[PDB]
Amino acid sequence: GSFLPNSEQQKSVDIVFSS
Amino acid sequence: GSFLPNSEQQKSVDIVFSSPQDLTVSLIPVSGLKAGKNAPSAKIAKLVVNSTTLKEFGVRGISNNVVDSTGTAWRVAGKNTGKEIGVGLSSDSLRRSDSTEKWNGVNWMTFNSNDTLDIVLTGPAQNVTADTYPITLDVVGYQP
Amino acid sequence: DLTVSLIPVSGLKAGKNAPSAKIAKLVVNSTTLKEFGVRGISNNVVDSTGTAWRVAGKNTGKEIGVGLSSDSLRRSDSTEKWNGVNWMTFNSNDTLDIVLTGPAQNVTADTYPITLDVVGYQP
């Protein structure tokens, strides 16, 4: 049993509110 | 006693520990978001995580202000205004976890690789100033 | 002569595994020989009888400790010497367990080979 740091992954996006 | 040299044999077999390996990830901003008073739990992004050789994916929000013990709710600042909004996994998404795991102590909520999850404006209705708000998530393979 | 079967346990899992988890069953049968000796064969044998050794992930290149289980070791008839080399002996027509030696080994998600040498012994 465990976590796989081997496949840890980071992701970023921009959320846009218009007005 | 004696050993029988002519009876000596070598035998070999393979042992396999499996299948946890890898995943792919995608984070899609929701179209048509409008400044001002928003609906409670308004959807703002869709998270996709995909894989064959894994199943329980873990996810946490990453920011300068994470507000719960699993990192599934946090606050983010607008680029142009610096105003903060509360974001996190939707209540429906939270209820679809596979587990609540403690990476050597650090908590993560876990989800089936291949599911989509919703990121929403958390809490009661928020009044959101027009701006661009960055969101960052960390995703990881969990394995029982 | 001897008839030898070495049977992998199926569905094993990665990361923290049980201390001493069973990983293979050794089956040695004979109509003629009362006993056999057995040693693990690898690039890193770790005790004087060759009943504990290390092996590694074929794809990831990382190690695991393997060997006869403590129960299996306690079934030995004796430890004998063949021109000075120790071989633990066991009754033929028996099975023995090969296990993950040591603590909850963090087994990496891979395939691992095991090789044993088995020899007939007449007491």
Side-chain angles (χ1 to χ4, degrees):
Chain A
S2 186
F3 283 73
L4 279 65
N6 313 22
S7 52
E8 176 164 47
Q9 307 179 307
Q10 184 172 221
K11 202 104 278 193
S12 304
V13 297
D14 288 342
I15 306 307
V16 183
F17 289 80
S18 303
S19 60
Chain B
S2 54
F3 290 83
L4 283 94
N6 299 319
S7 77
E8 192 174 359
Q9 288 187 218
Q10 198 185 251
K11 202 104 278 193
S12 304
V13 297
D14 269 19
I15 314 305
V16 184
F17 295 76
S18 153
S19 297
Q21 308 287 359
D22 62 307
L23 335 73
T24 74
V25 180
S26 301
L27 187 51
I28 307 149
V30 167
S31 67
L33 298 172
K34 297 315 278 279
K37 197 180 178 81
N38 271 254
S41 292
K43 295 174 176 166
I44 65 176
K46 179 137 288 186
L47 171 69
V48 199
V49 175
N50 275 106
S51 191
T52 58
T53 46
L54 254 165
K55 299 286 154 290
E56 289 200 65
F57 78 82
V59 56
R60 279 182 156 263
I62 305 297
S63 80
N64 306 319
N65 189 183
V66 173
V67 303
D68 67 19
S69 66
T70 54
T72 52
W74 63 101
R75 300 182 61 76
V76 302
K79 291 196 188 192
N80 302 312
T81 70
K83 287 198 179 286
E84 263 183 12
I85 60 172
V87 303
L89 297 176
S90 71
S91 295
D92 291 343
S93 293
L94 292 168
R95 289 190 290 258
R96 294 158 51 213
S97 65
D98 297 273
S99 182
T100 296
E101 293 292 310
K102 298 185 179 181
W103 193 342
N104 303 329
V106 175
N107 324 290
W108 297 68
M109 286 178 63
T110 73
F111 300 90
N112 292 283
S113 298
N114 312 286
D115 270 61
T116 65
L117 302 174
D118 296 310
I119 307 307
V120 299
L121 295 176
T122 52
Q126 292 184 52
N127 196 316
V128 179
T129 298
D131 206 342
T132 296
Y133 297 86
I135 296 179
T136 299
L137 303 186
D138 270 355
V139 172
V140 57
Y142 181 75
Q143 135 42 20
Chain C
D1 300 0
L2 297 171
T3 61
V4 183
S5 302
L6 187 51
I7 307 149
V9 175
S10 64
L12 299 158
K13 294 298 314 309
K16 294 163 186 179
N17 278 243
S20 301
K22 295 174 176 166
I23 65 176
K25 179 137 288 186
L26 172 69
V27 185
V28 181
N29 293 128
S30 183
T31 60
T32 48
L33 298 171
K34 276 300 229 280
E35 293 181 22
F36 70 93
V38 57
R39 279 182 157 263
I41 305 297
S42 80
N43 306 319
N44 189 183
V45 173
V46 303
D47 67 19
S48 66
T49 54
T51 52
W53 63 101
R54 302 168 59 85
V55 301
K58 292 187 179 180
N59 305 275
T60 69
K62 320 200 188 321
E63 297 183 356
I64 58 174
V66 303
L68 298 176
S69 71
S70 295
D71 291 343
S72 293
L73 292 168
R74 289 190 291 258
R75 298 175 69 184
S76 68
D77 289 335
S78 67
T79 301
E80 305 290 342
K81 284 187 187 183
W82 190 8
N83 300 306
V85 178
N86 296 319
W87 290 76
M88 303 196 57
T89 68
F90 302 82
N91 296 325
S92 302
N93 305 314
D94 262 4
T95 65
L96 302 174
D97 296 310
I98 307 307
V99 299
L100 294 175
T101 50
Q105 289 180 63
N106 185 106
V107 180
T108 305
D110 194 358
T111 296
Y112 302 75
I114 296 179
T115 298
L116 303 186
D117 269 355
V118 176
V119 61
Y121 184 70
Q122 215 74 302

